[PDB]
Amino acid sequence: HWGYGKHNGPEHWHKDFPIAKGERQSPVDIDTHTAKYDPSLKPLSVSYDQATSLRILNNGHAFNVEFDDSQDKAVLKGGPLDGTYRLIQFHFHWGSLDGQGSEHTVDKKKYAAELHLVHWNTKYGDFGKAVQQPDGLAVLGIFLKVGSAKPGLQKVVDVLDSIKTKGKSADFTNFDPRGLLPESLDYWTYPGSLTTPPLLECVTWIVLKEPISVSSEQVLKFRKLNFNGEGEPEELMVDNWRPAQPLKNRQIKASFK
Ligand SMILES: O=C(O)Cc1cccc([N+](=O)[O-])c1
Ligand SMILES: [Zn+2]
DSSP, X not given: OOOSSTTTSGGGGGGTOGGGGSSSOSOOEEOTTTSEEOTTOXXXXXXXXXXXXXXXXXXXXXXXXXXXXXXSSSEEEEXXXXXXXXXXXXXXXXXXXXXXXXXXXXXXXXXXXXXXEEEEEGGGSSHHHHTTSTTSEEEEEEEEEESSOOGGGHXXXXXXXXXXXXXXXXXXXXXXXXXXXXXOOOXXXXXXXXXXXXXXXXXXXXXXXXXXXXXXXXXXXXXXXBSSOTTSOOOBOOOOOOOOOOOOSOOOEESOO
């Protein structure tokens, strides 16, 4: 099945998922000089004070931190969005080396990792319905650069030993995702897709301009995870990013001058 190896990686996905060659695929390169400032874009509203984290899972492709999305407890509104989007999970993409790992690029620059906070539009009632709609999902993307440690990440790093292999989960309550945000909420936005199969074209992307800093030791711990299940040959979970796709007939908008 699909993955990030030589024989099953991004360049092969189109055979099972023909939408891989579609008109609104993600990620993309953000060309800062051709993005257009749009004064009509509103500030983002991130309301995460009542978030309820539940569990952390190694799904064989990344690790997900899952939230209770049965009520409006952790929501995203404003920005380019109409309506209310509820947080369901976050996950990361990262590299084998500090000079790669992000999915989006900025003037062709790759960051060490990229955080995706995934939200679904409450008008569609459940996540599975929302992914079938062009405005179903809103994903907040945050870049990670290597430098100073991020204290609010450490609780995630320390539990990774307990979910080393595919299919393992652990209880993960009382985690506050506000400790992952940068100071500024200035952003770029464009219409795109999921970056893993099934690659559905259901996402409004909101990519923050300001990266967060994490330490070398924090990222090194991500690279100790395994793509494989327990008692199968070890293959390190690294380079779980899709490369940039053609922009086609899309414009990237900026919230800032
Ligand atoms: O890989 C999956 O399971 C599909 C999936 C599910 C949720 C969010 C996703 N995204 O691209 O942000 C992708
Ligand atoms: Zn992702």
